[PDB]
Design a protein around this ligand. Structure first.
Ligand SMILES: [Mg+2]
Ligand SMILES: [Mg+2]
Ligand SMILES: [Mg+2]
Ligand SMILES: [Mg+2]
Ligand SMILES: [Mg+2]
Ligand SMILES: [Mg+2]
Ligand SMILES: [Mg+2]
Ligand SMILES: [Mg+2]
Ligand SMILES: [Mg+2]
Ligand SMILES: [Mg+2]
Ligand SMILES: [Mg+2]
Ligand SMILES: [Mg+2]
Ligand SMILES: [Mg+2]
Ligand SMILES: [Mg+2]
Ligand SMILES: [Mg+2]
Ligand SMILES: [Mg+2]
Ligand SMILES: [Mg+2]
Ligand SMILES: [Mg+2]
Ligand SMILES: [Mg+2]
Ligand SMILES: [Mg+2]
Ligand SMILES: [Mg+2]
Ligand SMILES: [Mg+2]
Ligand SMILES: [Mg+2]
Ligand SMILES: [Mg+2]
Ligand SMILES: [Mg+2]
Ligand SMILES: [Mg+2]
Ligand SMILES: [Mg+2]
Ligand SMILES: [Mg+2]
Ligand SMILES: [Mg+2]
Ligand SMILES: [Mg+2]
Ligand SMILES: [Mg+2]
Ligand SMILES: [Mg+2]
Ligand SMILES: [Mg+2]
Ligand SMILES: [Mg+2]
Ligand SMILES: [Mg+2]
Lengths: 80, 79, 207, 86
RNA sequence: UAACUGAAGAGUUUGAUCAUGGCUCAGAUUGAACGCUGGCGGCAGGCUUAACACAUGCAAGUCGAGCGGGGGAAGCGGACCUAGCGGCGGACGGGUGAGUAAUGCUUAGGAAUCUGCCUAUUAGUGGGGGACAACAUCUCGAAAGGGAUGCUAAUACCGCAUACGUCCUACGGGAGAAAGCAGGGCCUUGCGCUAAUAGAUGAGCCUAAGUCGGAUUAGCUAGUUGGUGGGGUAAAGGCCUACCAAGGCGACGAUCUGUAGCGGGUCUGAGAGGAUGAUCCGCCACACUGGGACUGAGACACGGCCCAGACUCCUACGGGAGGCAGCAGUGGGGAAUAUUGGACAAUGGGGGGAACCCUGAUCCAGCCAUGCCGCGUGUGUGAAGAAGGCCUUAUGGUUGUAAAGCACUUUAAGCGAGGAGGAGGCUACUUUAGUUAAUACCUAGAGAUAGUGGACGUUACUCGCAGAAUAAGCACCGGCUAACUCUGUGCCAGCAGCCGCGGUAAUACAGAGGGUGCGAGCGUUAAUCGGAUUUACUGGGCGUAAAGCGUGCGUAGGCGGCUUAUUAAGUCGGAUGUGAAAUCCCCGAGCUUAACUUGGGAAUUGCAUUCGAUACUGGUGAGCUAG
């Protein structure tokens, strides 16, 4: 199954997520097919908090991908 | 969308099969002069048309046997 | 780590003032052994001083003016050799933008080794927040201002006199009234001394 | 097997293997009868040994016991050897 | 706008000199180890040696809304639990580098293939049978585990029927599936099951060119190279086999032997090169040693099966068990490398309609100066230049504003108080689409009131309190190389990277006083590149320093006169695809700064495809006469 999930690479105690389309069997931080944005839960000052490219999101959803429950909430949080 | 090579027949002693020799002029990595390099490909004949000393164009295909994956296309200059 | 030892002993080795031990009756007349190098054979006779001792000597002088140990100073040089100016004056720019140095010019504190005691001890409010790092680079527009919580200790009222009578540079817009700084842009290599030679430091760091 | 479900899987493996071997044997048996009729040379006995094998082969390729690409091959190569009888 | 900026020498052969030529030194780096010393925080990193043997716990389950049996609480019915059958998972995630010199990897391209779950679209789901576990009685055994006999459900198994499209066809025709369950009112949605297509994804196969030594290894092959018929595979193919033919590879290094996982990258260097392949990402291989197959969409399966070997363990001698190169840990080897910790709160993974269960992945915490980065160990004054120590022309000089004394300050550690963020959501309570008999149920979306949910965690951070109080060492001082004197010793004791010191004035040994460099570190050993133009492509030599074969002739090879037409292989230009991400570099954004993290670029100048240009080199044809 192709899915859309968050890959976690930041620093210890301050995480930074990539929004990534990938076969669900690969390791969380391993091989992937495409990256379509990013998510920063801390995001001080002039730093972005979320950025999701949505035309590629729609393309992959319609090809059969399954967004996670956090990426499905962030795609509704965006475009708002 | 089918890549081809042109080269000199060097054997035909086998049924339905030639052996082309392809030559290539390639510049050397550290001293950059030039080199003559050669590779012999086993290619597939059908009517046994090509003869030793001939120059022929071959193209790639699916395997035909163990060590044969090129098919003859024409005899460009029969000699 | 810092340096904690005789202050004017390092002034006699370098032959210049080095601006330590700030006082109203220094005139560099607080040692009376001045212009005599330290120790047993201090100025015994002439000195060879051949082409690696002069480079190292002036680098040591610069370092001891500002209180920077060798690792940090090497990092400064490496950063200055990277900017697209010229390695020479980038270094002095980087060294004059520190916190304790900027707060020493502004008059709070007599010597730099006490401007550091003020910054480190959480008594300075850069852009409204009590920072306690001594080497923070101060950029164009930083408001340096004394913390309202210690504007009474009498270490300041003499430091603000000794500051007067003295310089008031062309890149800090101070006023010893409410104790607020407003750092300008950094200075160029015409507002600081010209004995400080830095064509030798670039060749010292490139042997 | 150091788990409960590991030996349950081993246990089911054995039933499945016993049940599959019978059906593979069954397919080979009918291919053998068709082939030993093709040796005889009788076009009619052969076309009647072929009509009793095709349903068995297709039934067993539907259950997954063989691949359907393999049943297709057996059907084609066994029909091209009784057409060449007469 | 930036993404570029680049290159140093010294000592040592002589009485002296110039050259040659080695040796040594100053730099950067490390998964380091050792010695002396040791306050703190942030980020990382932590068996490189024995792919050595492994005690103990944990690392893969889940579903009662597929199915019979059971069980105990509670008031004969509701709820609740689970040994067995059945589904799905266990082929991922995690470890390690033994084998592998090309069936691997990298770069660029292909056909002849299959693909659970997921998305889309089409035709369906009809009616019957016979079993086996559990269970109930026997039964061998110390145990583990079987053995007999009956009895049973099912989305377990097998016929029969019917198939839009699917398979074979000689175009006439022939062949082949499936299963129920749940929630609300037979009819409705859901969740499933069957057949097919094509997308996603994932895997198998092919080709060309690159990928470490050795000729003190020159011949190697006999299913070996090719073809036809048959078998075999998901699929091309000597993959297999019977015949027919005889071939195929090799000085452009075959065969044989040694070593080795490969790449993105990392270190060094001005570059060109040279070393290397820990940590992070991709691919391959392996799982105590060798040989197999089963089940499955997928394995020839790390915590699965069979049988061979070794090896360990229990035993009642009847009989059996096992595989840390998963996380912790033990023994051993070694110069050397950590806790038998916490939670699933977050990101993922498995199962489930959900509730929720599992997860040594992961997120965290403990230990270690192992590295990088940052902070502290106080700040002013202070000339009776106190005493003491050391040198000394005996008076002075130096340690030295250094210390005291006096005046302050309290960063971080400590003791008290407040306190974000990492949690989006879910449950209730209203309301509006949605399909439908339907405003039920069930999927969606809007609203304010509450309830609930953090392992880290005494969190970061903020604010108070007391007092300089709790916090400095190591190497060196003849030249190279920054920095000098005294005493002890007498070629002894000793030092030493190189030159070399030491035989009674030792700036070179040992202590002492002074100084120099670095600083929570400082020295030594080991290793790589540099300096080394000291293997020289960039970029060296060969009369006498090392170096022209004793001399010819000639094979492969390399190179080759002049004019012209043509070709377009080398050469040059443009366009298109590719060159994973991370890393390096440049702008700039969060960390109080900095390390660090991160947005965007630039770069990856290599590869392939295609369209052009013809001066030069090559090919082809035609001419010439200086060789
Ligand atoms: Mg092959
Ligand atoms: Mg099960
Ligand atoms: Mg159960
Ligand atoms: Mg290996
Ligand atoms: Mg069934
Ligand atoms: Mg039927
Ligand atoms: Mg049925
Ligand atoms: Mg053939
Ligand atoms: Mg065949
Ligand atoms: Mg054959
Ligand atoms: Mg060889
Ligand atoms: Mg090896
Ligand atoms: Mg060089
Ligand atoms: Mg399966
Ligand atoms: Mg199978
Ligand atoms: Mg397994
Ligand atoms: Mg194990
Ligand atoms: Mg272990
Ligand atoms: Mg030991
Ligand atoms: Mg979890
Ligand atoms: Mg504190
Ligand atoms: Mg919170
Ligand atoms: Mg000297
Ligand atoms: Mg003496
Ligand atoms: Mg000595
Ligand atoms: Mg430090
Ligand atoms: Mg070199
Ligand atoms: Mg030479
Ligand atoms: Mg000679
Ligand atoms: Mg001669
Ligand atoms: Mg010749
Ligand atoms: Mg030629
Ligand atoms: Mg060309
Ligand atoms: Mg890249
Ligand atoms: Mg001619």
């Amino acid at each position: 199954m192709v899915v859309i999930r968050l890959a976690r690479g930041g620093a210890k105690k301050r995480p930074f997520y990539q929004i990534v389309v990938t076969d669900s069997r690969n390791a969380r931080d391993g091989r992937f097919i495409e990256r379509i944005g990013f998510f920063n839960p801390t995001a001080q000052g002039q730093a972005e908090k979320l950025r999701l490219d949505a035309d590629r999101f729609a393309h992959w959803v319609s090809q059969g991908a399954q967004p996670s429950e956090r990426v499905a909430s962030l795609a509704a949080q965006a475009k708002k | 969308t089918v890549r081809t090579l042109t080269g000199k027949v060097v054997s035909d002693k086998m049924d339905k099969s030639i052996v082309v020799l392809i030559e290539r002029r390639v510049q050397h990595p550290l001293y950059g002069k030039s080199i003559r390099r050669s590779t012999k490909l086993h290619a597939h004949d059908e009517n046994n048309v090509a003869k030793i000393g001939d120059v022929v164009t071959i193209k790639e295909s699916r395997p035909i046997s163990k060590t044969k994956a090129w098919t003859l296309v024409e005899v460009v200059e029969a000699a | 780590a810092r340096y904690i030892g005789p202050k004017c002993k390092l002034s006699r080795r370098e032959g210049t003032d080095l601006q330590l031990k700030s006082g109203v009756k220094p005139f560099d007349v607080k040692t009376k052994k001045a212009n005599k190098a330290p120790g047993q054979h201090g100025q015994a006779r002439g000195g060879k001083q051949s082409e690696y001792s002069l480079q190292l000597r002036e680098k040591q002088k610069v370092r001891r003016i500002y209180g920077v140990l060798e690792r940090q100073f090497s990092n400064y040089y490496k950063e200055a050799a990277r900017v697209k100016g010229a390695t020479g004056e980038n270094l002095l720019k980087l060294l004059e933008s520190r916190l304790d140095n900027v707060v020493y010019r502004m008059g709070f504190g007599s010597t730099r080794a006490e401007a550091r005691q003020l910054v480190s001890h959480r008594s300075i409010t850069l852009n409204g927040r009590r920072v306690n790092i001594a080497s923070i680079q101060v950029k164009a527009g930083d408001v340096i201002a004394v913390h309202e919580g210690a504007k009474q200790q009498l270490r300041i009222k003499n430091a603000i006199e000794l500051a007067a009578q003295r310089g008031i540079p062309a890149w800090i817009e101070v006023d010893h009234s409410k104790l607020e700084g407003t750092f300008k842009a950094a200075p160029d290599r015409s507002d600081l001394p010209a004995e400080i030679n830095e064509s030798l430091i670039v060749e010292l760091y490139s042997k | 097997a150091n788990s409960a479900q590991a030996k349950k899987r081993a246990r089911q493996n054995v039933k499945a293997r016993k049940h599959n071997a019978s059906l593979r044997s069954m397919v080979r048996t009918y291919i053998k009868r068709t082939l030993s009729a093709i040796a005889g040379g009788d076009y009619a006995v052969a076309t009647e040994a072929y009509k009793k094998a095709v349903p068995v082969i297709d039934r067993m390729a539907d259950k997954g016991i063989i691949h359907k690409n393999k049943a297709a091959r057996h059907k084609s190569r066994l029909n091209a050897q009784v057409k060449a009888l007469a």
